[PDB]
Structure formats: structure tokens, C-alpha cells
From Swiss-Prot, chains A, B:
The organism of origin for this protein: Arabidopsis thaliana
Record keyword Ligase present: no
Gene Ontology molecular functions: monoatomic anion channel activity
Phylogenetic classification of the source organism: Eukaryota, Viridiplantae, Streptophyta, Embryophyta, Tracheophyta
Gene behind this protein: ALMT9
Membership in a protein family: Belongs to the aromatic acid exporter (TC 2.A.85) family.
Regulation: Slow activation by external aluminum.
Protein name: Aluminum-activated malate transporter 9
Effects seen without this gene: No visible phenotype.
UniProt entry tagged with the keyword GTP-binding: no
Length: 385, 385
């Protein structure tokens, strides 16, 4: 509660913005000139604020659009069917009650398609609008006055919501993706260092977050394409997809780290005294990889191009040194006596897996640099100082 | 569309059941004795069917419970505050418009807690009920008639929804979890066989589904605890958690399978001519593991206890034979000349990783059998024939 508000102050301004919009609409409802029709249909404006106010501007824009589509299509269809119902003079209510079944069936069958799982809020508004207009106009045969009035109030509630959301400390969806990429770049480095230290001792959250947030990075990219130019990102078409490409290149590397963490939990493990022979090349490889990942993160955050010096030189030097050390001492990995128990053979052969995995991680590091260069070229990044 | 309906007929009965419930409520609204108050508040019953009809009975019960709690708490609070408002005779509307701000702030701050992410439908109904009751009773000063009437029509809509859902081909939430476990047991076997065949050639969906559905298996377990006894699962407290325990034991193996798939995508690979020397042992291990996983799946599906014969004898024997074959030919994994290029050394050392991973998979297979025995003991499984 209070501890969470003090930890993050971005969650105490959104609630007060919603309270302010609600108080404004309420003041306009209480302090208005009395009239017969408004009196009974005036609560339709304070209930739209509670249904259209979202955390970011892009979603607010993207979802309000779908809801409006659902509403206008349902209203037009309902009005057309209500007009057509007259022809069957003898059985008006039979046809009207036979149209609800066919529309509920079609609207429930079209929302179970696997590609429409994220759009159920647009099918619910369609069913609600269709039913309400048919069941609310049967008495007094008024179908063009029960919609034109009840739509202006919804428009006014959505206008107040959008104005308050957009002009009082806006929160943007491209600034949560630019930040998420930088956070993942540091989590992967922390996980790698923790894994190498845990293995050499006499790690989970980082790679789990960097391997499981692809959907967050696709929703934020589907919300950031609706927002107008602002701040440092001033261009009509911003290359938002290159951030997803860089994130995918980093997750491909993070799989190796997940496998190195799995190696620590394996039932079959190697004698520590044998691990302490290669104790000096794994920590150097880890330190160099973590430093490289943190330098890439820092460059991405400050939006600067890569300088001339090749950042992969020291890591490749440390990996070649690892390879040489493994080559000199390969007599500890196998047993030449049997050349032509099994638990001790597997325990011995378990160290080579860890070394080969570290080596593969290094061999993969290059794709992330290539993706970063592509991103820094598509978007005009500042020249390094 | 039609192809999906023909593929799965369970989605064509749910739609017709929602059409039947909607048509029943519509007929009961069209054909009733006219009265002043009902005429304007009678559409409140056809709109509850569209908001309370869910795929399973369990969820239907859980979500309706949480929605009723939100509605009743919001209504009681609104009525109490409306009563208290009188004291401030001079400024009634000021106090009423100043309570909306506070309630909106608290209801928006309590829904942003990380533990309440799955309950936003219960906070939206609370805010809507409070606002509607406060703003719809200011005129005429009627606060005990705007709720008692508008609640019996919601009770009638929910009663019709529950009767039609529960008595016309019900869909239960424990029969989708019992089926999901059996499907995962076969996907893991298919993935293992595909990976072992792909490596020796001159795999993804299975383990991805078996490693990413923990949330589906926890929501289905949070919906199955509300359902009454029925069919084969007849007991007051069914051991639904032992299915999740078995699923976790299988996912622990599926991690190793993911690592064996990762080995195929590695940049550094071994000459095929060297792999061909060990093909037979790897294929025997794969065949035996897949047969064991399919026998466990088949036993789980038919609810039968494990027989006397030990299922792991063959796999352990194929693994000891693998170990012996690796021991006889370890001179192909390293290079004794350098005892005291790096790409060829790494390519050579990459085969031992694959062999050690297969061995670890086998070493882990035991925990799944232990979990299965525990599950078959907690629930009364039939004696094997
Ligand atoms: C008993 C045990 C079971 C418990 C059951 C729990 C029940 C929980 C459910 C609670 C109530 C369920 C619904 C009740 C029936 C619905 C009718 C009702 O509540 O009356 C309210 C309301 C009152 O109508 P009146 O009293 O007849 O005047 O009727 C409505 O349904 C209209 C509400 C409209 C406000 C919704 C916001 C509009 C959305 C449009 C979005 C379009 C996009 C925005 C614009 C885009 C840019 C242009
Ligand atoms: C102490 C005792 C305590 C008693 C506790 C019970 C208290 C009394 C219970 C009643 C109080 C509950 C009040 C609110 C209940 C929550 C439900 C709610 O408020 O709303 C639900 C709901 C709105 O919120 P939603 O559920 O989120 O969608 O109501 C609706 O169905 C409205 C949906 C909007 C569409 C309706 C059709 C209007 C279309 C008009 C515009 C059409 C334009 C067409 C253009 C044609 C030309 C092209």
C-alpha cells in the first residue's frame, strides 16, 4: 500500500487523475439546467470515464477505437433490423426475439476464434448495444432518439477522459519499451555472473524476465504506434520494430545462460577439486561478458553509436585462453585406461558440458552487436563523444 | 469458421446455449403484464446473461461470487454515505461530489497492487455500482427503491444463466486438466524422439507447450474446486493438486529436452562421421524413453495403478551401454597430442555435451515415477488387470 506508493510515485498520479475527471463530470451533472430527457439519461457520462481511462495514451487511443467500432456497427444493425421488422406485421415480437438468437450465436462463435482472443471487449460491447437498442425501443417505437442522445453523452465522457489523460503528466508506451530493453540488458549480465560464481563456489530472475517478456514487448509496440511525436523520438515513423529485433537477439543468448543454470541443478556433478583447476579462465570469461553486456546497455540508454574500438577483442582473447587451458588438461575429462563405474565417468564428463556452454555463449554474443548496429543506423543516434 | 466448428463441436453448443438463454429472457420480457416501474428497468435482466455466462461451471461460480461481493459492498457503502450526507444540509452536493473523488482514488489505488491483477472485474463493478447509486438517487431522494428493484432482475438473469449452463451439456474444469496432463505426457515424448532423430540426420511445440502451461494448469485448478462431485471423480475433496505436482515433475525433464534441442541450433557442431559411431546407443535410449513416457501417459488416462514390473530397467540398461560405448571411444572427444585450432577442438568437444544431456534426462526420469505413485495412492486408482 503506502510502501508501494512511496516506492513508485507513478501510481499515485493516475488515481488522482481519474478522481479529477470523475469529479469534473459529476460537477457538470449536478450543476446543469434541468430538462426532462437529460435527467434520466445523464448518468451515461460518468460511467464512460470508468470504462475508457487506461494507463497509457496509446492503448486509450487503440481500444477506444475498437469500442466505438463495435458500438456503431451494432447500433446500425439494430436500427436496420428494427425497421425491417415492420413488414411481418402479425408477428413483430416473434421476429425480434428470433433475431437476438441469431446475433448472440454469431457473436459468440466469432469471439472463440484463436486470432480474436485479445478483442473480447469489442464483441461484448457489440452484443450489449444490439440487445439494448432492440429491447429499449419496442415500447413507444422510438429507435432514432434512444441512440442519438445516449451517444453525445458518451462522446463527452470520452473527451473529458482523453483531455485529462493527455494534458496532465502523460505516460507513454514507447518509454516503457525503451526502458525494458535497458533493464533486460542488465539482468542478463547479473544472471551470467551469478551463475559462474555459483558454479565455482567452494541467477534466475534475470534470465526468466529476459526470456518471458516478449508479449509485453509486443503489446507495448502495438500501443506505441498510435502516439504522436514527442520528446527525443521526433519522427513520423519511428523504428520501434528494431527494439524487438534487438530483444530477440539478446534472448537467443539468454537461452545459453538458462542452460548454464540448469547445469548447476543436475543430479550428476563433478568433483570440486577438478573444477578448481580451470578456476581462472571461467571467471575472466564471465567478467568480460558482463562488462560487454553492461556497455551495450549503457550505450542503448544514452542513444550513442558504437565507437571505433572493437568491443569483442578481450572476450575472444579470454575464450581462446580457455580453449588452450582445456586442451592442456583434457586428461582429466576422460579415462584412457579403457581405450580401444559409470557415475564417476559421467561426473568427470560433466565439466566439459559447462565449458562448451560458456564457449557457445561467447560464440553467440556477435549477433547482438550486429543487431545493435542495425538499430543505431535505422534511427539517427548521436555521434559518440 | 465452419472448419473450426467441424473440427471442434464443443464450440457450437455453447453459442446455441447462450442464444437459448437470451431468447428465454427476451420472451419473458416481451410477454408480461404491463406495470410502470418494470417497463423502464426490465432491460437489466437480458444484460446480465451477457456478462455472467462463462465457458465452465467453476469460473461461472467463482466470478459470479466476486461480482456479487463487489456489488453488495458498493451498494451498502453508497446507501450509508447518502444517508450521512444529510447532516451537511447547506452543502449536500459538495459532500456527494467530494466522496466520489475519494472512492475513485482508493478503488484505483487498490487495483494496481501486483497481487490483485486477476480481479479487475470486481473493482470495476464496485466503482460502477457506487457511482450509479449515488448519482441516480439525488433526484427524488430514493435510495432503497433504486437498488431493491434493480437487484431482483439481476438475480433472475443469473438464475436463468446458471440453470441453462448447468443442465444442458455442462463443461467441467477438471476434465480439461485431466486431459491436459495426458496431452503433455505425449508431447514430451514426441519432442524427445524428434530431437534424437534430428541430431543424427545426414520438436519445438511439444516441449514449449509442456513448459509454458503452468498458468493454465493453475487457473483450471482454481476453477475445479468450486464444482460438485460427478462422474468418475466422486469425493468431497478431490486431490487436484497432485496433478499439478506430476506436471511439475514432467516439466523438470522438459527443461533437459529443451537443452537437447538447443544443442542442434548451436553455431559450433561436430563432424557427422564422428556422430555416426554412436548412433545405435542414442537411438536405443530415445526409443526407450519415448516408450516409457507413453506408457505413463496411457496409465494416467485410464486411471490404473502401476504393475509390479519395474518400468526403468530397460532405460537404465541402454544408458549403461551408452556409457560403456563412450568410454571405449573417448579418444575422439579430445586430443592427447597437446597433453601436459580451437574451433575444431570445440566441435569435437560438442558431442560429449549432447551425450551428457541425454544421460541427465535419463537420471531425472525417476522423479516422474515417484510423483505418479504418490498421485495414484492419494486418489483411489483401479487395480491393474
Ligand atoms: C445473485 C448472485 C449472482 C451475482 C451476479 C453478480 C452481478 C454482477 C453484474 C452487475 C450488473 C450487470 C449489468 C447490469 C445490467 C446492465 C444495465 C445497467 O447496469 O444499467 C446501467 C445503465 C442505466 O440505464 P438506465 O437506468 O435504463 O437509464 O444502462 C446501461 O446499460 C448503459 C450504461 C452505459 C455506460 C457504459 C459505458 C459506455 C461504453 C461505450 C464505449 C464506446 C467507446 C467510447 C467512445 C469511443 C470514442 C468516441
Ligand atoms: C444494502 C443493499 C445493497 C444492494 C446491492 C445492490 C445495489 C443495487 C444493484 C443495482 C446497482 C448496480 C449499478 C451498476 C451495475 C454495473 C453495470 C453497469 O453499470 O453497466 C454495465 C454495462 C456498461 O459497462 P460494461 O459492462 O463495462 O460494458 O451496461 C451496458 O450494457 C452498456 C453498454 C454500452 C452499450 C449500451 C447500448 C447504448 C448504445 C447507445 C449508443 C448507440 C449509438 C448507435 C449509433 C446508431 C447510428 C449508426
Amino acid at each position: 500500500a503506502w510502501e508501494m506508493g512511496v516506492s513508485d510515485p507513478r501510481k499515485i498520479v493516475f488515481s488522482a487523475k481519474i478522481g479529477l475527471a470523475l469529479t469534473i463530470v459529476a460537477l457538470l451533472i449536478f450543476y446543469q439546467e434541468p430538462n426532462p430527457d437529460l435527467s434520466r439519461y445523464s448518468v451515461w457520462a460518468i460511467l464512460t470515464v470508468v470504462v475508457v481511462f487506461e494507463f497509457t495514451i496509446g492503448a486509450t487511443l487503440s481500444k477506444g477505437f475498437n469500442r466505438a467500432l463495435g458500438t456503431l456497427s451494432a447500433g446500425g444493425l439494430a436500427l436496420g433490423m428494427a425497421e425491417l421488422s415492420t413488414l411481418f406485421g402479425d408477428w413483430e415480437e416473434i421476429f425480434c426475439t428470433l433475431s437476438i438468437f441469431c446475433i448472440g450465436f454469431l457473436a459468440t462463435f466469432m469471439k472463440l476464434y484463436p486470432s480474436m482472443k485479445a478483442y473480447e471487449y469489442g464483441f461484448r460491447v457489440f452484443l450489449l448495444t444490439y440487445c439494448y437498442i432492440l429491447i429499449s425501443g419496442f415500447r413507444t417505437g422510438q429507435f432514432i432518439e434512444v441512440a442519438i442522445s445516449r451517444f453525445l453523452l458518451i462522446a463527452l465522457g470520452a473527451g473529458v477522459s482523453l483531455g485529462v489523460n493527455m494534458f496532465i503528466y502523460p505516460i507513454w508506451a514507447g518509454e516503457d519499451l525503451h526502458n525494458l530493453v535497458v533493464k533486460n540488458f542488465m539482468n542478463v549480465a547479473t544472471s551470467l555472473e551469478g551463475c559462474v560464481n555459483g558454479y565455482l563456489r567452494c541467477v534466475y530472475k534475470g534470465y526468466r524476465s529476459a526470456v518471458e517478456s516478449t508479449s509485453q514487448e509486443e503489446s507495448l509496440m502495438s500501443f506505441a504506434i498510435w502516439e504522436p511525436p514527442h520528446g527525443p523520438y521526433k519522427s513520423f515513423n519511428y523504428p520501434w520494430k528494431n527494439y524487438v529485433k534487438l530483444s530477440g537477439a539478446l534472448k537467443h543468448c539468454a537461452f545459453t545462460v538458462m542452460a548454464l543454470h540448469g547445469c548447476i541443478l543436475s543430479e550428476i556433478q563433478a568433483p570440486e577439486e577438478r573444477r578448481q583447476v580451470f578456476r581462472q579462465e571461467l571467471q575472466r570469461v564471465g567478467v568480460e561478458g558482463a562488462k560487454l553486456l553492461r556497455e551495450l546497455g549503457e550505450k542503448v540508454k544514452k542513444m550513442e553509436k558504437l565507437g571505433p574500438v572493437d568491443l569483442l577483442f578481450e572476450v575472444h582473447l579470454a575464450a581462446e585462453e580457455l580453449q588452450h587451458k582445456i586442451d592442456k588438461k583434457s586428461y582429466l575429462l576422460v579415462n584412457s585406461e579403457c581405450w580401444e563405474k559409470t557415475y564417476e565417468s559421467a561426473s568427470a564428463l560433466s565439466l566439459a558440458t559447462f565449458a562448451s556452454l560458456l564457449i557457445e555463449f561467447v560464440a553467440r554474443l556477435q549477433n547482438v552487436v550486429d543487431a545493435f548496429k542495425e538499430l543505431s543506423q535505422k534511427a539517427n543516434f548521436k555521434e559518440p563523444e
